[PDB]
Design a protein around this ligand. Structure first.
Ligand SMILES: *[C@@H]1O[C@H](CO)[C@@H](O[C@@H]2O[C@H](CO)[C@@H](O[C@@H]3O[C@H](CO)[C@@H](O)[C@H](O)[C@@H]3O)[C@H](O)[C@H]2NC(C)=O)[C@H](O)[C@H]1NC(C)=O
Ligand SMILES: *[C@@H]1O[C@H](CO)[C@@H](O[C@@H]2O[C@H](CO)[C@@H](O[C@@H]3O[C@H](CO)[C@@H](O)[C@H](O)[C@@H]3O)[C@H](O)[C@H]2NC(C)=O)[C@H](O)[C@H]1NC(C)=O
Ligand SMILES: *[C@@H]1O[C@H](CO)[C@@H](O[C@@H]2O[C@H](CO)[C@@H](O[C@@H]3O[C@H](CO)[C@@H](O)[C@H](O)[C@@H]3O)[C@H](O)[C@H]2NC(C)=O)[C@H](O)[C@H]1NC(C)=O
Ligand SMILES: *[C@@H]1O[C@H](CO)[C@@H](O[C@@H]2O[C@H](CO)[C@@H](O)[C@H](O)[C@H]2NC(C)=O)[C@H](O)[C@H]1NC(C)=O
Ligand SMILES: *[C@@H]1O[C@H](CO)[C@@H](O)[C@H](O)[C@H]1NC(C)=O
Ligand SMILES: *[C@@H]1O[C@H](CO)[C@@H](O)[C@H](O)[C@H]1NC(C)=O
Ligand SMILES: *[C@@H]1O[C@H](CO)[C@@H](O)[C@H](O)[C@H]1NC(C)=O
Ligand SMILES: *[C@@H]1O[C@H](CO)[C@@H](O)[C@H](O)[C@H]1NC(C)=O
Ligand SMILES: *[C@@H]1O[C@H](CO)[C@@H](O)[C@H](O)[C@H]1NC(C)=O
Ligand SMILES: *[C@@H]1O[C@H](CO)[C@@H](O)[C@H](O)[C@H]1NC(C)=O
Ligand SMILES: *[C@@H]1O[C@H](CO)[C@@H](O)[C@H](O)[C@H]1NC(C)=O
Ligand SMILES: *[C@@H]1O[C@H](CO)[C@@H](O)[C@H](O)[C@H]1NC(C)=O
Ligand SMILES: *[C@@H]1O[C@H](CO)[C@@H](O)[C@H](O)[C@H]1NC(C)=O
Ligand SMILES: *[C@@H]1O[C@H](CO)[C@@H](O)[C@H](O)[C@H]1NC(C)=O
Ligand SMILES: *[C@@H]1O[C@H](CO)[C@@H](O)[C@H](O)[C@H]1NC(C)=O
Ligand SMILES: *[C@@H]1O[C@H](CO)[C@@H](O)[C@H](O)[C@H]1NC(C)=O
Ligand SMILES: *[C@@H]1O[C@H](CO)[C@@H](O)[C@H](O)[C@H]1NC(C)=O
Ligand SMILES: *[C@@H]1O[C@H](CO)[C@@H](O)[C@H](O)[C@H]1NC(C)=O
Ligand SMILES: *[C@@H]1O[C@H](CO)[C@@H](O)[C@H](O)[C@H]1NC(C)=O
Ligand SMILES: *[C@@H]1O[C@H](CO)[C@@H](O)[C@H](O)[C@H]1NC(C)=O
Ligand SMILES: *[C@@H]1O[C@H](CO)[C@@H](O)[C@H](O)[C@H]1NC(C)=O
Ligand SMILES: *[C@@H]1O[C@H](CO)[C@@H](O)[C@H](O)[C@H]1NC(C)=O
Ligand SMILES: *[C@@H]1O[C@H](CO)[C@@H](O)[C@H](O)[C@H]1NC(C)=O
Lengths: 118, 420, 421, 118, 427, 128
């Protein structure tokens, strides 16, 4: 499950399925916990969908990488760093990137419709 | 480079959530109606803090709620809040119990237009003089009789994370409750904690792998307690030697009061035995690892200064209040601790509730392990005293190695990849 | 040769009834309830509103009744007081009231089953019914429950918020009269901060009209309906109970206490409210002008005294005041003040129910509050209007009239020129 | 959120990420509110999926438009009307259209299964 | 070379146990305020051709669900009601001797007592009439020792109405339409339904009232027919009409016992006093019993002798009638010997303090009902036990009264996902 | 398609039909799945959880959004050494499910592995 947490990003990316399978599965507090797990799951799926990555664990987009977000080389990011470190580092850009991902997909989706029409 | 998006990423943050209870007419067995894995994280360094650990606060919410629920649908003893006509038990005392037991008679309800005269025995701790006496707690709150069919015996229970959460466990044998920990593993549930409720001495807990581990929020702060975990147990065995009976009295429509009946055989004082050498070695070990925080100096153990000053515990079905003054006595084949027994119990340091513990028939003998001490501190010399109260420290001592984290399996990174 | 195309996220909605939750601006019963801590203009949307057929009012009413009962549910009952009382009048230091205060002694329980005590307390005349031999009112229908003295019923702003998938539309038309189309509609998440103030006849501490006095009704020609009048400027009313009260706490059982009114220090004086006179005369002149627009160009309008409905009936400092408004509603329209005397009660049969009753512990000291009159409830060849009301839903309609709940239904189809393949 | 509600259909179609990302997020009233939001969300996402539009905000289909449902041309529909107006104009034909979309997908899936057999 | 292909929406299922919800039709009834979901006026049923499904009445969880729901509603409806604890006092009782016929001698008592009132410092002298079965000249109510008595609220109706048990999403109820179905076994005519037919939650012993009828013939069903430890349920082919009455014209004496606390006592009888009774058509009963015998003879031997014999709530026929509780003597029905080759009147007793499901401390006090009571009902089945052979009218386990209606239904879970091989490969 | 609009068989109508016929009614079965106080909330929460668990599983195999999904895992003769004509023309889904019940964990594991490899391969090609 989380064994990959101690590995670099370039290795951990090969063990995504094992984590995805474990996101699902008085007494009110336990019922609330179950409802929350469902809401969190769906929210993450909604974001992948709205960004055009529904159904994928790994996807690529058309938003270019901004050196402001990170100035590291791939040989540092994927080979000499883990995901916990990467997440701590990109803390001021998460919302920016997510907004850009939604904008890009909205433009791509309209372009697809216009192409299908011709 | 292009933005790439990954889902299923092994990342987490500290979090506070609802945990569920699992178990491998007991109240925890009934409550924890969930049946009962570990993964090592090779290069994960994580930061733990047992003094700010929400799992502790959760046990002190769950244990109390369960306790109160279990006692709710039971016979209330409000009808016993009368003035009692009461004298001393003088037969078969053979000293050290003089005035300890009372023999009380009173006018009890029963049809609504009838009354009855009944009598019973009481321990003096539960009886207050107003030969006119009252039950000690009728002035503040109604006393509810615990249902005799309900067992409050602690069993191991396991705290388990809900999906999306994980419990991280610290394996550092030298971990002192705070700071970074290497050798962190992920588990789904805790190891099984017996919710033993006690003061001064921590009974039937976990042992340290080695030596003695002394933990506190701030070792130089005299306002904080010191929790000391031993790597060896001290064997202690407690007895209530009297052969007791019960007098079942109907007080209403299927409402029964279980009174102490009488004593078969001689009357004796309750007591606990501790071996001499085991205790002497144990304190010496505590001192050896304690000097490390104060300098090499005189370390004295002294007695306490009811629930806090005595060692409170539930032996069998009765609540003992034992005198540890002869245990904590040193300036650095067995000894006994005399004990008192009480039936009206005010738990969790609340005063608006009271429980009546029905008598246990027969003779009570329990054998248990001392796994840790609660000490307080208060010049080239210093004095350590048994501490107690609060009751969350009793759980911090087992939960100190665990933390709950929330998994957030979504993030981005740069890469050599574009769509189409 | 057009094809069906499916669009998701479409800005379309339908009228709906749902469950709203309460938020607040971060002890008090609502502060405990409204646990969630706390506008988009729709440029070309015309929408139809109807304050009389709204559901938000029914849900607010239900939440208030429910919360009130939950608050009293765990408090000590006063069934031990349903005994015969021996009552005489209080005669010391009485100005001129006469029969309003009585000194009642009685045989009450103690913490022991086998012991009794003799106690006495003061009661207001309106809470005591004669059989010197008296009993408390009720004790035939309903049991009396003492309100917990530590629990506050001070109204605080309540914000009703839509659940996900729903939205609240707000009407901004400055003269909106409660029904029909509104051309200035915006979308909000929460319904502003509304205080659950309870009163009848005169509505206190509500919203003001922005341009003029606005008169709203379900049917302006139906005399059986109430007329809700919203003022554009507030009228200040200063209310007080001048007597210096004390309180005696009597143990009645094992951890159970009753709070009794003790001796009053100083003179016994009448509770009253001071309404500014000039402001009141200007206020009615504005109301009348707006009424003439509906009742006739040459119709003479007169105000008159009404026939716990005929009184103001409000909660001030935690005490319940029943003020005589006949001092205000008496005129013909074609530094001075108006003093309204007020009666005080301790046993309250709230929300027009009789199976439940609350006892309000007395409050020590002297009580004064200052409130804003923001609206009136009136009931209907000259015309005469009288104060009316008593149905609590009509108070809440005055704050929720501009809000509507709709359900978002973000899925639909339309023709276009693309094919899937 | 609904800011595009008064705009024409041809304008409002570009604001579909909004009111997509905003649709999912005494006692049990809050659980009922949470559960309802989830159940409604899923009924709509699963309906798009059964029609073969999972993961898309705008999808083209193989079902032709019948002039009976609406005899207006594209210029009127996309440039003069808004979405509330359109919804009213074809409200009584919605169920027919939805049934046809499901039928169409069922046929497409079987046809793809056969082509993948070659 | 075949490949795995995944199919979602596959029409398969597994047996399952779940919680069903209650629906009712478009009607202060205890069921009406519970079965809040309106049923469809034109409900759906789907016939499944070529589906054989094994049904088993004694493993049917729907019965346990219904039994549980019944207890829950009956206990819940008594929570917000006046308790009668203040009546557990000594009473001064004498016999009622006013216009009593021989069949009623000793049945009614006239009891006076010192009751509580509105104020705690006052008491009142009141009196009421009681039935013999409800009392122990110094009397106590029959059940004040290890019990509490709660008065049922007079506004609440316990009249049975049709109840429909409906499946939650993901589940379905399968129904067996085989006219000859006898339980525990395969059924070849299976349909899926949204929910059950309406079932009336009639509570009775010995004779089953107002249930379904067999389509063609009397059906004898049991878990194991040769086992004397098991009951035999008999579903009748035609109904037998029974007319029950409580002929005495009663009144209601309302006593205020506290602050809105009312006790409803039985007042004096107007007119004379007669025994309650039921009229069973005689010719129908004889023919009906003969039909049962012909079917019993398909078991236990073709040429044997079958006898019927008789065996409070078990030995008599217990039922509710108009809100009143009747205990009728059925020895007048189960009295015959069968060999190869106008009405019956059953006297009835009335009891006011009720212990409905083999429980001791939870007793209900039925308020008296004003006027005269008459019920007309259908006997739709019998409960028999077995000792030439002898059968008797046993009963008392309420599950059998529901098992007899729910016998044709089974709950399954739909599991719409699976795989199969085919000639298809993903590119 | 004819007259007013499309018509469909009822829920489980195809349950006794053979697999080759029943596979054409997947949209019926997959449509009808979309639907004290604590008991009803538990019933509703459970229906959602069960539904999502199945959708999650289809997604991890790369089958999200499809009722019929072809994969890259070959069929083993040891799971079932049978002819396709028998499987699709002379057997129902209930019968098939009974026969293949000890292999579903095996099959699901294989499907999860195949999809993980395919997504990595797609990223590597997009990178060119
Ligand atoms: C620490 O753990 C030990 C077990 O390793 C606990 O000892 C056990 O305590 C229970 C309750 O006092 C005893 O149960 C009773 O046994 C008698 C028979 O002697 C039976 O009649 C009663 O109905 C009940 O089952 C149990 O026998 C005893 N086990 C042993 C081996 O002696 C000890 O109580 C724990 N310490 C604390 C403080 O709880
Ligand atoms: C209309 O709004 C005004 C405020 O603008 C309300 O007046 C305020 O009411 C509260 C609660 O009764 C008063 O608080 C209390 O003050 C006393 C001191 O006199 C203190 O001992 C208590 O602990 C508490 O803090 C507040 O002082 C008072 N403000 C003013 C200016 O008088 C008024 O009650 C509202 N009207 C209605 C009908 O609710
Ligand atoms: C079997 O089904 C029959 C027919 O539905 C039931 O008989 C009916 O029972 C109800 C309730 O006891 C009777 O209603 C009452 O009628 C009186 C008439 O004056 C009225 O004052 C009451 O307010 C109430 O409406 C109904 O008349 C009666 N029908 C017949 C033909 O007698 C029977 O009770 C059911 N048996 C069992 C055991 O459930
Ligand atoms: C139930 O089973 C029978 C066979 O026992 C099925 O009958 C076949 O139906 C098809 C329909 O196209 C015909 O072409 C075959 O010739 C029939 N077979 C025989 C032996 O007659 C029947 O269709 C099945 N029922 C359902 C609903 O599928
Ligand atoms: C942890 O770091 C060591 C450094 O030598 C490396 O060999 C090992 O593979 C790493 N562990 C994991 C899980 O990647
Ligand atoms: C992101 O890239 C754009 C490219 O135009 C640049 O203007 C912007 O400043 C960059 N973001 C930050 C925070 O530097
Ligand atoms: C953004 O960067 C600054 C400087 O490193 C840091 O203090 C701040 O906490 C960062 N923001 C977040 C969200 O971590
Ligand atoms: C019971 O009450 C009577 C009243 O006269 C008293 O004499 C007697 O001593 C009381 N008995 C007890 C045990 O309190
Ligand atoms: C525990 O160890 C940390 C290591 O940094 C130290 O700062 C802290 O004071 C220690 N606390 C105790 C009670 O030993
Ligand atoms: C009880 O404690 C004494 C302490 O000296 C020990 O020797 C003895 O073995 C203990 N009893 C049991 C059963 O272990
Ligand atoms: C209320 O009291 C304030 C105290 O400053 C005073 O200014 C105001 O005029 C009073 N209002 C009325 C209506 O008398
Ligand atoms: C005011 O109305 C009441 C009835 O509510 C009546 O008794 C009283 O006499 C009236 N007083 C005046 C001045 O009209
Ligand atoms: C609102 O309508 C006017 C025409 O009446 C148009 O010019 C304007 O652009 C519209 N606004 C929006 C937001 O679509
Ligand atoms: C087609 O578009 C033109 C645009 O000017 C409009 O006048 C005409 O009415 C439209 N016809 C239909 C069928 O919508
Ligand atoms: C009623 O009469 C019978 C004799 O017929 C007698 O046994 C019984 O004790 C009497 N009951 C009362 C209360 O007098
Ligand atoms: C009520 O109590 C008095 C007490 O003297 C007694 O004489 C009378 O008989 C009692 N009455 C009843 C009906 O129990
Ligand atoms: C009530 O008392 C009688 C004896 O007088 C006894 O036989 C009966 O069993 C008791 N009831 C209960 C429930 O124990
Ligand atoms: C069932 O009743 C019908 C008439 O309704 C009759 O013809 C048939 O013979 C009866 N069945 C049996 C087993 O007698
Ligand atoms: C019920 O039918 C099954 C069919 O297999 C049979 O085995 C069983 O003996 C029958 N029981 C009775 C009482 O008819
Ligand atoms: C059915 O009953 C007979 C006795 O009549 C017994 O021998 C047999 O074992 C029972 N059947 C089962 C499955 O136990
Ligand atoms: C029962 O009453 C009906 C009329 O309601 C009558 O037709 C029938 O014959 C009666 N049955 C008996 C057994 O008296
Ligand atoms: C059964 O009937 C016989 C007469 O045949 C009678 O003596 C006996 O008391 C009856 N028993 C019951 C419980 O009805
Ligand atoms: C019962 O007696 C009363 C006396 O007034 C009469 O009105 C009523 O009709 C009688 N009831 C019956 C069913 O005869």
């Amino acid at each position: 499950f989380l064994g990959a947490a101690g590995s670099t990003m370039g290795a951990a990316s090969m063990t995504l399925t094992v984590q995805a399978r474990n996101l699902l599965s008085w007494g009110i507090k336990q019922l609330q916990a179950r409802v929350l797990a469902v809401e969190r799951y769906l929210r993450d799926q909604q974001l992948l969908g709205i960004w055009g990555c529904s159904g994928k664990l790994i996807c690529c987009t058309n938003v270019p990488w901004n050196s402001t977000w990170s100035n590291r080389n791939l040989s540092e990011i994927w080979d000499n760093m883990t995901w916990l470190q990467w997440d701590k580092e990109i803390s001021n850009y998460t919302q920016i990137i997510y907004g850009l991902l939604e904008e890009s997909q909205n433009q791509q989706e309209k372009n697809e419709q216009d192409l299908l029409a011709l | 480079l292009w933005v790439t998006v990954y889902y299923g990423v092994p990342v987490w943050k500290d979090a506070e959530t609802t945990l569920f209870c699992a178990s491998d007419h007991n109240v925890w067995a009934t409550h924890c109606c969930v049946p009962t894995q570990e993964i090592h994280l090779e290069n994960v360094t994580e930061e733990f803090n047992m003094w700010k650990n929400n799992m502790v606060e959760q046990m002190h919410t769950d244990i109390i709620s369960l306790w109160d629920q279990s006692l709710k649908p039971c016979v209330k003893l409000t009808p016993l809040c009368v003035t009692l006509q009461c004298t001393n038990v003088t037969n078969n005392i053979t000293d050290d119990m003089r005035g300890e037991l009372k023999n009380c008679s009173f006018n009890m309800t029963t049809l609504r237009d009838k009354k009855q005269k009944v009598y019973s025995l009481f321990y003096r701790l539960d009886v207050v003089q107003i030969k006119e006496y009252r039950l000690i707690n009728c002035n503040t709150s109604a006393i509810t009789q615990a249902c005799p069919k309900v067992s409050f015996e602690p069993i191991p229970i396991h705290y388990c994370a809900p999906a999306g959460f994980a419990i991280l466990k610290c394996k550092d044998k030298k971990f002192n409750g705070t700071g970074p920990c290497t050798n962190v593993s992920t588990v789904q549930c805790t190891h099984g904690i017996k919710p033993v409720v006690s003061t001064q001495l921590l009974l039937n807990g976990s042992l340290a792998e080695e030596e003695v581990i002394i933990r506190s929020e701030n070792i130089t702060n005299n306002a904080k307690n010191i929790l000391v975990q031993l790597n060896e147990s001290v064997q202690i065995n407690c007895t209530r030697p009297n052969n007791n009976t019960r007098k079942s009295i109907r007080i209403g429509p299927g409402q029964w009061f279980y009174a102490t009946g009488d004593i078969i055989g001689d009357i004796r004082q309750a007591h606990c035995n501790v071996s001499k050498a085991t205790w002497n070695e144990t304190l010496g070990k505590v001192v050896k690892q304690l000097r490390k925080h104060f300098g090499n100096t005189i370390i004295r153990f002294a007695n306490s200064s009811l629930e806090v000053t005595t060692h409170s515990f539930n032996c069998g079905g009765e609540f003992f209040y034992c005198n540890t003054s002869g245990l904590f006595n040193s300036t650095w084949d067995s000894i006994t601790l005399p004990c008192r027994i009480k039936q009206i119990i005010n738990m969790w340091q609340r005063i608006g509730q009271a429980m009546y513990a029905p008598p246990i028939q027969g003779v009570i003998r329990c054998v248990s392990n001392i796994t840790g001490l609660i000490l307080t501190r208060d010049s080239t010399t210093e004095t350590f005293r048994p501490g107690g109260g609060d009751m969350r420290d009793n759980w911090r001592s087992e939960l100190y190695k665990y933390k709950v984290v929330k998994i957030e399996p979504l993030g981005v990174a740069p890469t050599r990849c574009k769509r189409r």
